[PDB]
Short mmCIF file of all heavy atoms in Angstrom, two decimals:
data_model
loop_
_atom_site.label_atom_id
_atom_site.label_comp_id
_atom_site.label_asym_id
_atom_site.label_seq_id
_atom_site.Cartn_x
_atom_site.Cartn_y
_atom_site.Cartn_z
N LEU C 76 40.41 -17.50 12.21
CA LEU C 76 39.93 -18.71 11.69
C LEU C 76 39.77 -19.81 12.70
O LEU C 76 38.77 -20.53 12.59
CB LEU C 76 40.76 -19.30 10.54
CG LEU C 76 40.57 -18.45 9.19
CD1 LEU C 76 39.15 -18.47 8.65
CD2 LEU C 76 41.10 -16.96 9.16
N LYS C 77 40.58 -19.94 13.80
CA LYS C 77 40.61 -20.87 14.85
C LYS C 77 39.37 -20.93 15.74
O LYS C 77 38.73 -21.90 15.95
CB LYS C 77 41.86 -20.79 15.80
CG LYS C 77 42.07 -21.78 17.03
CD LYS C 77 42.84 -21.11 18.22
CE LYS C 77 42.03 -20.14 19.02
NZ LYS C 77 40.88 -20.54 19.92
N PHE C 78 38.76 -19.75 15.97
CA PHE C 78 37.60 -19.40 16.70
C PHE C 78 36.31 -19.91 15.94
O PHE C 78 35.53 -20.37 16.70
CB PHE C 78 37.43 -17.80 16.79
CG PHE C 78 38.49 -17.10 17.71
CD1 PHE C 78 39.20 -16.01 17.07
CD2 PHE C 78 38.85 -17.56 18.98
CE1 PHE C 78 40.24 -15.39 17.81
CE2 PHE C 78 39.79 -16.89 19.73
CZ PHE C 78 40.38 -15.85 19.11
N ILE C 79 36.22 -19.70 14.63
CA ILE C 79 35.20 -20.24 13.79
C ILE C 79 35.63 -21.72 13.29
O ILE C 79 35.10 -22.13 12.25
CB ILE C 79 34.87 -19.42 12.60
CG1 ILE C 79 35.98 -19.16 11.49
CG2 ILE C 79 34.36 -18.02 13.04
CD1 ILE C 79 35.43 -18.76 10.18
N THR C 80 36.40 -22.41 14.04
CA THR C 80 36.75 -23.81 13.96
C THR C 80 37.99 -23.84 12.96
O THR C 80 37.90 -23.17 11.90
CB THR C 80 35.73 -24.79 13.59
OG1 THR C 80 34.66 -24.74 14.51
CG2 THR C 80 36.31 -26.30 13.60
N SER C 81 39.11 -24.39 13.48
CA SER C 81 40.45 -24.34 12.84
C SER C 81 40.55 -24.91 11.42
O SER C 81 39.75 -25.71 10.93
CB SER C 81 41.42 -25.08 13.58
OG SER C 81 41.44 -24.51 14.99
N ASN C 82 41.50 -24.31 10.72
CA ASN C 82 41.84 -24.42 9.24
C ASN C 82 43.29 -24.18 9.20
O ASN C 82 43.79 -23.31 9.72
CB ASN C 82 41.10 -23.46 8.19
CG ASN C 82 39.65 -23.15 8.76
OD1 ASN C 82 39.32 -22.16 9.44
ND2 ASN C 82 38.61 -24.00 8.31
N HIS C 83 43.90 -25.11 8.46
CA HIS C 83 45.30 -25.00 8.14
C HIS C 83 45.69 -25.96 7.20
O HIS C 83 46.84 -26.24 6.75
CB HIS C 83 46.22 -25.53 9.47
CG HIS C 83 46.04 -24.53 10.69
ND1 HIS C 83 46.43 -23.18 10.79
CD2 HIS C 83 45.31 -24.87 11.83
CE1 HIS C 83 46.04 -22.84 11.99
NE2 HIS C 83 45.37 -23.79 12.67
N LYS C 84 44.73 -26.67 6.47
CA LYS C 84 44.83 -27.64 5.52
C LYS C 84 44.85 -26.97 4.17
O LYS C 84 44.05 -26.09 3.86
CB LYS C 84 43.91 -28.82 5.43
CG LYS C 84 42.30 -28.43 5.32
CD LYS C 84 41.35 -29.54 5.33
CE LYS C 84 39.98 -29.12 5.11
NZ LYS C 84 39.63 -28.38 6.49
N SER C 85 45.88 -27.34 3.37
CA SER C 85 46.36 -26.56 2.10
C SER C 85 46.46 -25.06 2.33
O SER C 85 45.96 -24.26 1.61
CB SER C 85 45.56 -26.87 0.89
OG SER C 85 45.52 -28.18 0.48
N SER C 86 47.08 -24.65 3.47
CA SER C 86 47.10 -23.33 3.91
C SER C 86 48.46 -23.15 4.45
O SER C 86 48.74 -22.18 5.19
CB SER C 86 46.21 -22.93 5.08
OG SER C 86 44.90 -23.14 4.85
N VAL C 87 49.43 -23.96 3.85
CA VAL C 87 50.75 -23.75 4.24
C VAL C 87 51.52 -23.82 3.11
O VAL C 87 51.14 -24.59 2.12
CB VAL C 87 51.20 -25.03 5.20
CG1 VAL C 87 50.39 -25.10 6.53
CG2 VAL C 87 51.13 -26.29 4.46
N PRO C 88 52.76 -23.10 3.08
CA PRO C 88 53.68 -23.12 1.98
C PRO C 88 53.87 -24.34 1.20
O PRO C 88 54.38 -25.33 1.62
CB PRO C 88 54.99 -22.59 2.41
CG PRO C 88 54.58 -21.70 3.63
CD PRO C 88 53.23 -22.36 4.20
N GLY C 89 53.55 -24.37 -0.15
CA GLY C 89 53.75 -25.28 -1.19
C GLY C 89 52.38 -25.69 -1.45
O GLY C 89 52.21 -26.86 -2.25
#
Side-chain angles (χ1 to χ4, degrees):
Chain C
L76 285 300
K77 184 206 72 67
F78 302 128
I79 62 154
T80 309
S81 306
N82 325 88
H83 294 291
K84 59 179 187 290
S85 302
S86 295
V87 290

